[PDB]
From a paper:
Mutations altered 16% of the B.1.1.529 RBD surface, clustered on an RBD ridge overlapping the angiotensin-converting enzyme 2 (ACE2)–binding surface and reduced binding of most antibodies. The RBD is a major target for neutralizing antibodies in both convalescents and vaccinees.
Two Fabs bound to the RBDs in up-conformation in each spike, with the third RBD in down position. Overall density map is shown to the left, with protomers in light green, gray, and light cyan. Three of the 15 amino acid changes on the RBD, S446, A484, and R493 are positioned at the edge of epitope, with their side chains contributing 8% of the binding surface. LY-CoV555, which targets the same region as that of a class II antibody, completely lost activity against B.1.1529. R493 causes steric clash with the CDR H3 of LY-CoV555, explaining the escape of B.1.1.529 from LY-CoV555 neutralization.
Residue numbers in the entry:
A (entry chain L): 1 to 216
B (entry chain B): 360 to 555
C (entry chain H): 1 to 231
The structure:
């Protein structure tokens, strides 16, 4: 089966010129396949930007321009601003109903005003223990971009089952926020000396530890 | 069930390529032939001659063929300003690797990727299994060779039993109280016209 | 104005059936092609099925062959999608998309989708209507040793999702932030609504976690205040 190859993510300073590439690993890409460029903001619906390989949608600024570069679909992005950073998609058309999208690319404004992620780890309260349930919350906020790796360790053993991570979401100040949930039994909580929540984000690691004995 | 008054249809065409066979281009109003068919497309400038009754050609044998004993003709002209864009409009495209010589006036629509036979490429688009068409470019400026020309092909039937279009036109004035030949609605005679 | 309303979304046991409803306002669906595209969290968009402007031909992706059916209604300008034999991988957000038209003659393999509605999310989970469990989060005085203190309310094993969580029935808006649910071992969700407030507002004002589970029709107003652990 055909697969469209895309670069994961770029980082470009504001006001600069960058281009995105979308091609085919099984052959060349022609204009008959009709490249199209669409942008997705997480938590919302995408917008139509580029269609016809050279034409912009109604209301799309002329600052966005696309074309074909060899066998790879290319979009030209000049003069970066704060709001351009988002997920982007490329659309290719096969014969009679087969349309394949790329892997998606998360564009960024490189650094913006960078903010350190904020962690808040809270072990379950006494009322939760009284109900024979336990859940730990470790929220992460004020981080960018969304390349965050949240992991949990019980005492000195990492735990992967029963724990999941949330996709970072847009804030009101152009920043990302997420959370982590550790849903286990109260017996495990009281049988462990401490619980830790680690988050890796852009090479910066943040550690937070809570002690069940403190709540008692 | 109408009259096709071509006196305005050939219009103020900058260049009307009315190369017509089987009838003089002016003597069609008096004709009362059968139904007519309309269809049109756009072809690159150079090979407007390449389409004709019964000669070879990549566009002729793959996308549109014309019969030898064809009654009717075509009209072609330039539409470079309306079609071509500064960046180049990429919307027009023609078949590339048809493995046959399509007969004149048959429908052929398909989107499957062509295979050169031999091995079953099985929809992978590898070797000997190529996607056809290869759409044009229509650059904002170029010579007449690869310039967008708008062409319309016109075909009308015959045998005159289903009288379809025809055209009477040629309406004259009226006089009275004088000897004159009259052809009011097909009947003909000589006499004087007055009141009753 | 051109708008598409997507309804019928929800959380369904695997193996059941449901009819996704899509209503078009401002135009007629008979004049344009229609597309159905789903998107899952942590993933890219995934093409599902389309219907042409005339309906002479119908196409589906290989993963959905023989299970789902698409139908259109020109009389009331309404669009329906039939879902059958649901499985856990179908948990995604579907967007009903509008393509080009016969009003503009385009070549074959019609070019699709330019504008669409907000869509609706669907989840395939193995559970039934279950009473939501709400647990207040009362931090210790150590966590309140600062300008701002954060309090929340944990909501666990609620089904079907989503559950509307709020504080003071919408009276408090600044410093209130909720978190997306996560999948557990048993397949049920859990969320927290942590509210950040200055420590000077404690005592005089009461923060109550107001949660509503409409499918189960329960109303829990969990009072959340720092623990009075005088020890």
């Amino acid at each position: 089966q055909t697969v469209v190859t895309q670069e994961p993510s770029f980082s470009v300073s504001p006001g600069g010129t960058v281009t995105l590439t979308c091609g085919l690993s099984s052959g060349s890409v022609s204009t008959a396949y009709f490249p199209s460029w669409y942008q997705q903001t997480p938590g919302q619906a995408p917008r139509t930007l580029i269609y016809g390989t050279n034409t912009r949608s109604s209301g799309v600024p002329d600052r966005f321009s696309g074309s074909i570069l060899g066998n790879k679909a290319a979009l030209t992005i000049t003069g970066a601003q704060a709001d351009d950073e988002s997920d982007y998609y490329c659309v290719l058309y096969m014969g009679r109903g087969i349309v394949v999208f790329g892997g998606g690319t998360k564009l960024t404004v490189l650094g913006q005003p960078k903010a350190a992620p904020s962690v808040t780890l809270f072990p379950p309260s006494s009322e939760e223990l009284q109900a024979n349930k336990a859940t730990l919350v470790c929220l992460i906020s004020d981080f960018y971009p969304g390349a965050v790796t949240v992991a949990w360790k019980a005492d000195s053993s990492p735990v992967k089952a029963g724990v999941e991570t949330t996709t970072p979401s847009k804030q009101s100040n152009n920043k990302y926020a997420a959370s982590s949930y550790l849903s286990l039994t109260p017996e495990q909580w009281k049988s462990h000396r401490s619980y830790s929540c680690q988050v890796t984000h852009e090479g910066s690691t943040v550690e937070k530890t809570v002690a069940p004995t403190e709540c008692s | 069930n109408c009259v096709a008054d071509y006196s305005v249809l050939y219009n103020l065409a900058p260049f009307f390529t009315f190369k017509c066979y089987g009838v003089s281009p002016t003597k069609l109003n008096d004709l009362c032939f059968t139904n007519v068919y309309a269809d049109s497309f756009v072809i690159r400038g150079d090979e407007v001659r390449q389409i004709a009754p019964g000669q070879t050609g990549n566009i002729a044998d793959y996308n549109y063929k014309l019969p030898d004993d064809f009654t009717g003709c075509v009209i072609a002209w330039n539409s470079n300003k309306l079609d071509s864009k500064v960046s180049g409009n990429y919307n027009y495209l023609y078949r590339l690797f048809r493995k046959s010589n399509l007969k004149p006036f048959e429908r052929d629509i398909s989107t499957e990727i062509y295979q050169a036979g031999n091995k079953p490429c099985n929809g992978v688009a590898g070797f000997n299994c190529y996607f056809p068409l290869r759409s044009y470019s229509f650059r904002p400026t170029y010579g007449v060779g690869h310039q967008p020309y708008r062409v319309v092909v016109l075909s009308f039937e015959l045998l005159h039993a289903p009288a379809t279009v025809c055209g009477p036109k040629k309406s004259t004035n009226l006089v009275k109280n004088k000897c004159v030949n009259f052809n009011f609605n097909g009947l003909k005679g000589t006499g004087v016209l007055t009141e009753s | 104005q051109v708008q598409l309303v997507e309804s019928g979304g929800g959380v369904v046991q695997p193996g059941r059936s449901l009819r996704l409803s899509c209503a078009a306002s401002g135009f007629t669906l008979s004049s344009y092609g229609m597309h159905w595209v789903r998107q899952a969290p942590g993933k890219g968009l995934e093409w599902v099925a389309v219907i042409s402007y005339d309906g002479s031909n119908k196409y589906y992706v290989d993963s959905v062959k023989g299970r789902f059916t698409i139908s259109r209604d020109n009389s009331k300008n309404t669009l329906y999608l039939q879902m059958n034999s649901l499985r856990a991988e179908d948990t995604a957000v579907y967007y009903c998309a509008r393509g080009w038209a016969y009003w503009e003659l385009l070549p074959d393999y019609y070019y699709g989708m330019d504008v669409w509605g907000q869509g609706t999310t669907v989840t395939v989970s193995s559970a039934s209507t279950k009473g939501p469990s709400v647990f207040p989060l009362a931090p210790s005085s150590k966590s309140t040793s600062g300008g701002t203190a954060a309090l929340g309310c944990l909501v666990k094993d609620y089904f079907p999702e989503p559950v509307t969580v709020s504080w003071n029935s919408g009276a408090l808006t600044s410093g209130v932030h909720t978190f997306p649910a996560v999948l557990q071992s048993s397949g049920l969700y859990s969320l927290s609504s942590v509210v950040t407030v200055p420590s000077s507002s404690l005592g005089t004002q009461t923060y109550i976690c107001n949660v509503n589970h409409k499918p189960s029709n329960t109303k829990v107003d969990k009072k959340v205040e720092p623990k009075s652990c005088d020890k």
